[PDB]
Amino acid sequence: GLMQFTLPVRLCKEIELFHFDIGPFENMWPGIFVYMVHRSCGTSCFELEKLCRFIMSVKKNYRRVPYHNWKHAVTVAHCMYAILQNNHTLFTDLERKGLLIACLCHDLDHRGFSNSYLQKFDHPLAALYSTSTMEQHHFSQTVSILQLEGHNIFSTLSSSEYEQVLEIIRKAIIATDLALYFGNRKQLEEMYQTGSLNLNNQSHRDRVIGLMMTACDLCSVTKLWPVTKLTANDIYAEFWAEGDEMKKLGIQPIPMMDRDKKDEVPQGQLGFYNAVAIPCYTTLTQILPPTEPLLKACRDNLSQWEKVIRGEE
Ligand SMILES: O=C(Nc1ccnn1-c1ccccc1)c1nc(C2CC2)ccc1Nc1cncnc1
Ligand SMILES: [Mg+2]
Ligand SMILES: [Zn+2]
Question: Could you tell me the domains of the chain?
Fold first, then answer.
């Protein structure tokens, strides 16, 4: 009850900022997550014993892949923490509870392969879940861990509150399917510009939480250049492995996934920032003005990639 988590001074201060990097000490990441739940949600919203047991089972169910790993889960949870702390009064008690858990759980048991690769491989998951294949799996793994003995962190919620928080988590996790992002942002763009956006309309809240999930999921493009540049290596290590696996199925992969086409990466990053990242954080900043630092940092990294292309690095 009276056991507060405290970080060292530099972490205590920098964890409040959007561009925070959780660092290379894996054993500190659980403590960083609990610190964020305690400050974002309250020291009372979860039983520490159950939360700790839930976190360690979630960690165990992330795989040792270069990018879609435990460090990604905690990085995505921190971006959501920063959005929630900078938007204190906008979110319900169940939303703050659900969204940090959704972020920690959003890539559970990821193998380093796209929905596309699972479909062309004819993986059993592609037969069980025809769209948002990996994301339905991620939600399924979240529910499985919630049902382990002593792992029900929501046990004190009513039956109807419990159903609400699991529906927040399901929608939040499904929304990390980037295929769903493009249409969601377009609709939010139109709703904002025609002035019909209404945060009391549950269907509107869902869309806005969806965009927050994309923003948090992509937040490696909102870090200081040295972090962004080194994280880019980890994402391409996954892409090039999937490309190898495409070649093994007798399919020439898209250039993004072909390791014979590393030279095209800088131009590929421009397209990604212009088509995906900048529009995401732009629309997010229009809806939630205090998330402007994510857009600013994103624009900084686009400019760094333009400098790479012009041979200035
Ligand atoms: O770079 C990414 N994608 C990409 C490169 C070239 N074209 N595209 C592209 C275009 C349209 C749709 C999907 C992909 C990327 N993707 C993802 C998600 C989509 C899996 C997450 C992070 C990403 N980048 C990155 C991460 N951390 C540090 N720096 C950069
Ligand atoms: Mg994912
Ligand atoms: Zn993710």
Answer: 28-310 (1.10.1300.10)
